[PDB]
Amino acid sequence: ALPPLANFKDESGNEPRTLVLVIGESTQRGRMSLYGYPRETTPELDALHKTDPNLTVFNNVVTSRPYTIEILQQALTFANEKNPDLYLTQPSLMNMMKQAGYKTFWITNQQTMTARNTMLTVFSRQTDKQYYMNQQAREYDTNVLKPFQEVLNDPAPKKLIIVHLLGTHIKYKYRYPENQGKFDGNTDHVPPGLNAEELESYNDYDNANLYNDHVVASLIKDFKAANPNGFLVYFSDHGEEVYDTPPHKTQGRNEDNPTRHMYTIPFLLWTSEKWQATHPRDFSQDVDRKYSLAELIHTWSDLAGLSYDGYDPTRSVVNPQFKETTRWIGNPYKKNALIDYDTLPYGDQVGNQ
Template structure:
């Protein structure tokens, strides 16, 4: 009896040690990769309870073969979760969050490849091999050479209690540290959001907002939505390279707002706020309305011309909003790793402009300066070649990517100018607005290329916001004279729908002119980002 009990305890102890191998690795590597002591202890405790949960399940099975199989599966699952957790901390210094998962759900295979190419550095690759491959192989070897054949009959009740307690604590206290729960909840929320958007925002008219019908005066307005373009690399904003030669030529005809930020640094959640009534206080807003629906209700003919593929894992949020337009043109059919030039949108724009001179609002969604910069401009725009930019980081990769990005910005400049020239030739009551959904970090403040809210650098948030107005618009809207005095206003583009409505004279009950950058009743508000951080206070801290 005593020998049998001793054997069972030894087997139980061995089983616990084997299942806990990923936990011990987290305890050690987490000291170096999890930046905050509180976060470290929360991650260790949360992962400890998850390990206890898997261990309890394994103990509940009496048959040796089942127990060995469950032990191996437990280690594999825990190892994969550990690798994701540590690699994300390594790259971003924070835990994997719901907002990051939203981006993953909306990403196509090409963008995933771009992401993984930057994500897997030497540490991630080596730790992946160690944690995801070598550890399971080690466990297989261990299970073949040790005995875990105890019956554990008296301990099953205790194991059941451990299972219940662990499950409760993980769900109630450590759910944000648990990747399984975070992923499930995020995907459920994302699926619900997409369903609501398809139900509400894809319709030509919103049932939640009543819009006053405007007169039939012919008008042609254009909203150009850029991609990944930071004003840090724009000549118009003081950049020391000639990236905006075409727009600089007509600089005196433009109003260049110099203190505008995007609400997020990822396209989907940024455009969800920019193009609808959603904002920081009402994200993924129910009973929502888009600028396309407002324009439809006001009597405009609406057109959506896009150089981005309309589908990812699901329909993209911007594509769902685009479905409300009277006519849709999705020009690009290639993945974003292919050569895509925004000039391909211009013939479509010409066709739309030639339509009967009714009230038109045209939305143009550019590929802009999206990743794989070298594929965003033709060879004749390969202007910055061997030049060495005045960059903070001067290694070979940084210099190459900065040159490619600046070439893409220079090409983007020519496309925006072409749009303005075409609208100008119409000689109608018109405006052209250009902004980017977010920016990119190009080794400006740190040794990094790309965008993510975990680093949240200034170039990722600070975007161009430029307005051009025709002579007819200026004559019929006398308050235009005050616009140039507003160009220094600190503004979060999550309120763009109010600025857009102001310019297009679209009136509806929910219109709040204090949120319009063009209004004389504008009230500056806190520009909140991430989890409620004040952007302007963050900038002051970063600049110290």
């Protein structure tokens, strides 16, 4: 029902390309060894970072809201904390890529009620072809690897592939096979004072991070094995507090009682050799920029070579004209409830910038 973006231009040429957006779940920045966590929770992404110069790791990205649909309404559209309802009145990222001539795919391991009018169902139905892998629980994110390959074989020249993961969502223990609890019973690098149940839950979160590392690295590796022209962005919708913040008694997500560990997220960009060769771009000076996921669509637009009325290059984290803005958090529907993420305590801790 919404009109197209005006003065729409694509400067990325007309060669075939495949672009991938991997939406993780409940994965914070501070429990991944890729971001300095002393437990080896992400060995495959670490090794990829050491050996592949085209993996760009962004160190200062946070989400704006710690609830899945509430953040995805901002991340996937032009809505943000100051204007949270723009997802109703302006196009989404998927709409935008359709206007650019891409065939769009939605692969997901999240339980989607296709017969019901949920906001996630609407988003996933905005694409040309959907793969719902979790329609009924022990369903692991490796479920997406087979349809991913299938979509990679799809002959459309320009393709957008969205992969929606369960990531490290509660309950953490169910995100990974029972025989892959690498950190079960381990007390190294654990905060003090946990009881048996809290300790088990903490280690379960690190195990889920290990499996999620395997899944994201597998998506990158399979994509690379297709020798594609394109790139893949991986982000988590939001983080998750798991006894990280002193006094180490809190587990979960609470927007009215925010901690940094609920808001820090991984943010990775893998660029294929063909795309980097054809679209040379240096990101090495962008990796520490303070950025909010709420403006993702501009970054995506920048990476895809798209401009239009409403495009804001200064809010793309890879743009030479990038200008840092306040990273708002807080409920945008309450009266004057927005606060600066930087005001939260414990920002000096590892992975908690």
